[PDB]
Amino acid sequence: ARIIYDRAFLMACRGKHPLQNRWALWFFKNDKSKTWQANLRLISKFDTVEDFWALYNHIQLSSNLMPGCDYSLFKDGIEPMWEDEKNKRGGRWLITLNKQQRRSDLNRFWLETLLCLIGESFDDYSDDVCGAVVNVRAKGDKIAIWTTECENREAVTHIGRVYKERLGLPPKIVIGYQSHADTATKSGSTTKNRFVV
Amino acid sequence: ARIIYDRAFLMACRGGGGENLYFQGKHPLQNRWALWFFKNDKSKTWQANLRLISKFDTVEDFWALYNHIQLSSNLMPGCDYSLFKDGIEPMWEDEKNKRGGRWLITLNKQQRRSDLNRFWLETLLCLIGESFDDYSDDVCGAVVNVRAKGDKIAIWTTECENREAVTHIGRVYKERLGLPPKIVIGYQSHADTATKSGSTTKNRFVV
Ligand SMILES: C[C@@H](O)c1ccc(-c2ccccc2F)cc1
Ligand SMILES: C[C@H](O)c1ccc(-c2ccccc2F)cc1
C-alpha cells in the first residue's frame, strides 16, 4: 500500500521512516557563459523522512536566495527539464508570489510544497507528480508542482485543489495549471491555463 | 518469530496465479527490500548514476519484479544491481555498511554465460528467505558487478567484528551456491576494500 504521511507526522520527525519515492534535489543557475547541462547540479538524493529533514536543515542553514537560481525536487530518474519523457506531456500548478511575499510566504510555501511531494498527499494521483520547482527572482518568486500528463484532468485537478488547501490560500486566490508545451512558447505577458482551481 | 523460507518454498511461489483475496494471499517477507541500479558514468556524479528501481515485501512481488527485470533487461558491463534492506543505501559509507564487509565470489569470463544468472538468483533467495537464521539480521544486501574482465557477486553484512555471524553467513552462502569445497570465498571489510594497496584486498575470513 502507498506510504502516505500527513503534515503533523512529517513535522514530528524533524530534529527511519521510508518515503514512497526516492527524490533528487537539483540546483540550476542560468549562467549564459555555460551550457544548460553545466548549469544543472544534482545536490543530493534521499528516500526517508529523516534524510529529507537533514538535507532541508543543511540547505536552509548553509543557504542562498540568489535570484536567477532555481531549486527542484524531482522523483529519482526524472530530470528537472520539461523535455524529460516524464515531463514532456505534462504541466505545472503555478503559485506566483509578489516581492513582499519573498519575506513572508516563500519559505513556508516552499516547505508545504515539499511536504506534499514526499508525504504523497494526493492519494493515487501522487503518481502523476514529477517534482516541484522554486524560481527565485527579483520581480517575484514562483513555486510549482510539475505533473506528468496534462490530459489526466481528474488527477491534475485533485492535485491543484489539495495543493491549494495545503498552502492555505483563500478560495478567492486562484491557481493555474499550464502545460509545459504552452509555457515553452513565448506568446506575450501570459501563458494560458489549461485548468484553474 | 522470523519469517524464513527455504529455496523449495520460494520456487513454488513463482507464478502470478495468486488471486490475493482480501489482499491477504501473498507470502510476507521478514524484511522489505529495495532494488538499485548503478552505472559508473564518469560524466555524472555518483549520486546521479545510482537509481532506486523498486521495493517489495512479499515472495510474489519479488518474482514479479525478477521476471520483469529478467525479461526486459540484460547486463551491460560497468553496471551494478544491488538488493538491500529498506533504508540501507548500497554504498559502503552508509551507517549500516561502514563497519561491515562482504562475502565475495568472482566469476571468470566464461562463467558470465554458465553461472552468473544462477548464482545471482541463489544469492537473492538467501536474502529474501532469511537463510542465515538470527544472523540474517547482519545481512545488508547483495551486489552484482557486471564486468568485462569477470563478474562479482557479494553479500554485504553490517559488522566486521561479529565473527560468528559473518562466518555462518559465509558457510551457508557457499553451501547454497553449491560451490566445490576446493573453491574458497573471502570476506573483506569495506574499509580495506576502499584502500587500494596493491593487486589484492586482505580477507578477514575465508570459507
Ligand atoms: C531556498 C532554500 O531555503 C532551500 C531550498 C531547497 C531546500 C530543499 C532541501 C531538501 C530537499 C528539498 C529541498 F527543496 C531547502 C532549502
Ligand atoms: C539484469 C540482471 O540479470 C538482473 C538484475 C537484477 C535483478 C533483480 C530482480 C529482482 C530483485 C532483485 C534483483 F537484483 C534481476 C536480474
From Swiss-Prot, chain A:
Disease: Autism 19: A complex multifactorial, pervasive developmental disorder characterized by impairments in reciprocal social interaction and communication, restricted and stereotyped patterns of interests and activities, and the presence of developmental abnormalities by 3 years of age. Most individuals with autism also manifest moderate intellectual disability. A chromosomal aberration involving EIF4E has been found in a patient with classic autism. Translocation t(45)(q23q31.3). The breakpoint on chromosome 4 is located 56 kb downstream of EIF4E.
Protein known as: Eukaryotic translation initiation factor 4E
Known outcome of mutating W82L: Decrease in mRNA cap binding
Protein location: Cytoplasm, P-body; Cytoplasm; Cytoplasm, Stress granule; Nucleus
GO molecular function: DNA-binding transcription factor binding; enzyme binding; eukaryotic initiation factor 4G binding; mRNA cap binding; RNA 7-methylguanosine cap binding; RNA binding; RNA cap binding; translation initiation factor activity
Part of the full-length chain shown: 36 to 217 of 217
Quaternary structure note: eIF4F is a multi-subunit complex, the composition of which varies with external and internal environmental conditions. It is composed of at least EIF4A, EIF4E and EIF4G1/EIF4G3. EIF4E is also known to interact with other partners. Interacts with EIF4ENIF1/4E-T; promotes recruitment to P-bodies and import into the nucleus.
Sites annotated (Microbial infection) Interaction with potato virus Y VPg: K139
Effect of S33A: Does not affect ability to rescue growth of yeast lacking a functional EIF4E/CDC33 gene
Region (EIF4EBP1/2/3 binding): 17-20, 53-57, 112-119
Function summary: Acts in the cytoplasm to initiate and regulate protein synthesis and is required in the nucleus for export of a subset of mRNAs from the nucleus to the cytoplasm which promotes processes such as RNA capping, processing and splicing. Component of the protein complex eIF4F, which is involved in the recognition of the mRNA cap, ATP-dependent unwinding of 5'-terminal secondary structure and recruitment of mRNA to the ribosome.
GO CC, one annotated term: RISC complex
Domain of life: Eukaryota
Residues where mRNA binds: W36, Q37, W82, E83, R137, A138, K139, G140, D141, K142, T185, K186, S187
Key word Nucleus present: yes
Coiled-coil zones: none
Outcome of swapping S189A: Abolishes resistance to cellular stress and DNA-damaging agents. Does not affect ability to rescue growth of yeast lacking a functional EIF4E/CDC33 gene
An individual GO BP term: regulation of translation
Miscellaneous information on this protein: The antiviral drug ribavirin relocalizes nuclear EIF4E to the cytoplasm and reduces the elevated EIF4E levels found in acute myeloid leukemia patients, suggesting its potential use as a therapeutic agent. Ribavirin suppresses EIF4E-mediated oncogenic transformation by binding to EIF4E at the functional site used by the m7G mRNA cap and competing with the mRNA cap for binding to EIF4E which leads to relocalization of the majority of EIF4E to the cytoplasm and inhibition of nucleocytoplasmic mRNA transport.
